[PDB]
Amino acid sequence: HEVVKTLVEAIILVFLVMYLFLQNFRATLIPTIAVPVVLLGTFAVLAAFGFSINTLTMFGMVLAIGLLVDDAIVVVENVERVMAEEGLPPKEATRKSMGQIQGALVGIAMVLSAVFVPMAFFGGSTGAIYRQFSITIVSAMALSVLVALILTPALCATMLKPIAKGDHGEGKKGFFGWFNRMFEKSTHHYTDSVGGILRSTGRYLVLYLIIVVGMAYLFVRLPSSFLPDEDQGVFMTMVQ
Amino acid sequence: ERLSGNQAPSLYAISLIVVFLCLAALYESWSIPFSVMLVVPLGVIGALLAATFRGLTNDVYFQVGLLTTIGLSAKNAILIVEFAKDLMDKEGKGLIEATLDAVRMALRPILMTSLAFILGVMPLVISTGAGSGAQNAVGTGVMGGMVTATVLAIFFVPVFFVVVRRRFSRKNEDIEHSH
Amino acid sequence: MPNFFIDRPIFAWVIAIIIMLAGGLAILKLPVAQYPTIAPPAVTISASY
Numbered sequence: 001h002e003v004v005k006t007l008v009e010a011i012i013l014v015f016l017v018m019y020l021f022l023q024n025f026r027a028t029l030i031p032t033i034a035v036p037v038v039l040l041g042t043f044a045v046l047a048a049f050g051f052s053i054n055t056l057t058m059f060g061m062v063l064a065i066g067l068l069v070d071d072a073i074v075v076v077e078n079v080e081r082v083m084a085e086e087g088l089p090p091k092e093a094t095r096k097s098m099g100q101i102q103g104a105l106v107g108i109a110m111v112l113s114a115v116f117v118p119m120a121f122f123g124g125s126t127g128a129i130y131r132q133f134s135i136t137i138v139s140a141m142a143l144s145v146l147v148a149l150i151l152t153p154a155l156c157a158t159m160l161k162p163i164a165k166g167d168h169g170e171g172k173k174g175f176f177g178w179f180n181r182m183f184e185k186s187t188h189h190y191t192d193s194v195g196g197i198l199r200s201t202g203r204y205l206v207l208y209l210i211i212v213v214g215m216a217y218l219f220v221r222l223p224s225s226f227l228p229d230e231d232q233g234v235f236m237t238m239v240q
Numbered sequence: 241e242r243l244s245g246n247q248a249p250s251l252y253a254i255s256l257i258v259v260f261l262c263l264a265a266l267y268e269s270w271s272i273p274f275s276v277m278l279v280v281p282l283g284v285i286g287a288l289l290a291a292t293f294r295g296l297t298n299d300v301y302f303q304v305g306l307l308t309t310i311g312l313s314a315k316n317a318i319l320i321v322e323f324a325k326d327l328m329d330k331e332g333k334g335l336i337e338a339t340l341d342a343v344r345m346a347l348r349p350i351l352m353t354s355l356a357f358i359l360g361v362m363p364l365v366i367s368t369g370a371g372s373g374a375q376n377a378v379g380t381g382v383m384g385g386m387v388t389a390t391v392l393a394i395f396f397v398p399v400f401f402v403v404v405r406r407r408f409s410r411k412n413e414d415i416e417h418s419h
Numbered sequence: 420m421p422n423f424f425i426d427r428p429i430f431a432w433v434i435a436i437i438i439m440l441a442g443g444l445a446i447l448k449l450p451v452a453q454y455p456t457i458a459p460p461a462v463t464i465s466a467s468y
């Protein structure tokens with residue numbers, strides 16, 4: 001239940017960061033809706049596979065959220081800045097937009113499931129632990145693509161407001177209009193940061209190989225174990 | 241544990257291999273996937289550092305957490321390169337210059353994605369109470385990994401692309417096509 | 420689909436490769452026997468007087 005509580009909080013915190021960037025309430029409600037459709041579906045898949053609701057499947061639910069949100073945003077944002085760079089109503093704006101990303105969507109999910117699918121195949125007693133986490137994430141990612149092809153286009157086609165005019169608007173709100181304006185030349189102060197580290201290449205490469213050796217160093221130093229002790233609110237004392 | 245209990249390496253190696261192959265399919269190139277895959281240590285370093293500084297262990301909750309980070313760090317890097325390649329092929333723009341346009345036509349979506357996830361695993365890291373041991377564990381690995389994975393990649397993914405594209409030739413472009 | 424992969428020769432290669440390593444890995448863990456189970460199952464009751 002405590003993991004259920006952080007799962008809920010995770011959703012609300014994702015919603016809040018949705019709203020901070022995408023200022024429109026209906027635009028952030030779309031990814032927000034996608035998340036519980038995909039996660040509840042995932043429970044329905046777990047059932048189909050005879051899995052259980054446990055620490056690893058619950059953690060899968062929480063950790064899937066980043067992956068799911070991306071599918072929803074890629075559709076919303078593409079539709080947004082199709083309207084925000086031509087002048088189509090949300091219904092044809094999403095149709096065009098879906099027309100050019102749905103391949104990518106399906107495609108990228110397959111690439112990404114590959115980072116989880118192999119680990120569905122651990123062996124022995126340790127094995128079921130990672131299998132149940134891996135199938136959860138991959139189940140989620142699959143349904144995420146499903147929802148992105150079915151519900152999300154529908155919601156963009158019916159819940160998004162039209163725009164037209166090469167728009168992303170600086171002046172009509174208070175706090176949020178400020179946020180945009182900072183990020184704007186924050187984006188350029190970032191762009192030439194890259195442009196300066198492109199005429200570089202030489203020793204920016206060397207730094208990367210330091211991160212890599214520092215990585216393999218930090219790795220072997222770290223002890224290993226299976227599962228941590230938890231405070232279960234009870235214990236035993238032996239007398240011999 | 242005499243019952244052969246150490247399979248992680250070969251499994252991570254298989255997983256790494258299938259990722260490269262899948263990426264090859266996505267970009268229709270053997271070399272370009274490398275510019276996506278070099279992002280992997282950038283996320284691993286964060287997890288190791290975070291687990292180190294909070295005295296955690298390399299356990300189950302450390303391994304599932306890092307695949308999560310690698311998954312999303314991959315996804316960030318992929319849509320950078322996706323733009324850079326499509327600006328060079330559809331728009332026909334030059335190497336360095338299509339990187340730049342590509343580079344953060346996607347920053348704002350990448351900072352959405354990452355920061356929303358990072359603040360989302362935050363209930364795990366600050367979790368006290370029943371089972372918080374597992375929540376604390378799985379949480380600080382992902383958070384530290386994602387924090388480094390994205391701040392670092394956003395400067396290194398631009399580099400990864402251009403360095404790979406030069407070592408793996410095509411000496412009759414760069415500079416400004418159209419078609 | 421043939422037209423699709425005529426244009427995308429490495430994608431066709433990775434499908435072939437992914438199939439192949441899945442197969443290689445399968446060989447490492449597959450049991451070996453002359454036969455599968457083909458005998459009908461028997462149960463014997465033994466008693467003594």
Ligand SMILES: CCCCCCCCCCCCO[C@@H]1O[C@H](CO)[C@@H](O[C@H]2O[C@H](CO)[C@@H](O)[C@H](O)[C@H]2O)[C@H](O)[C@H]1O
Binds near residue numbers: 039
């Ligand atoms: C964003 C949406 C997805 C997130 C939501 C997921 C939450 C998952 C945590 C649920 C843990 C399972 O907890 C489960 O709860 C239900 C509801 O009390 C219980 O169900 C029990 O009460 C309900 C009525 O309240 C009865 O219909 C049922 O006969 C009885 O068994 C299950 O016996 C229990 O095992």
Ligand SMILES: CCCCCCCCCCCCO[C@@H]1O[C@H](CO)[C@@H](O[C@H]2O[C@H](CO)[C@@H](O)[C@H](O)[C@H]2O)[C@H](O)[C@H]1O
Binds near residue numbers: 115226245256280306
């Ligand atoms: C596609 C991108 C993926 C690239 C990721 C590459 C980085 C490597 C990821 C982490 C490495 C795996 O970490 C590895 O975990 C296994 C499995 O529990 C540990 O194995 C150990 O764990 C426990 C506790 O001792 C025992 O049950 C087991 O018998 C023992 O061998 C190893 O000590 C460790 O080396």
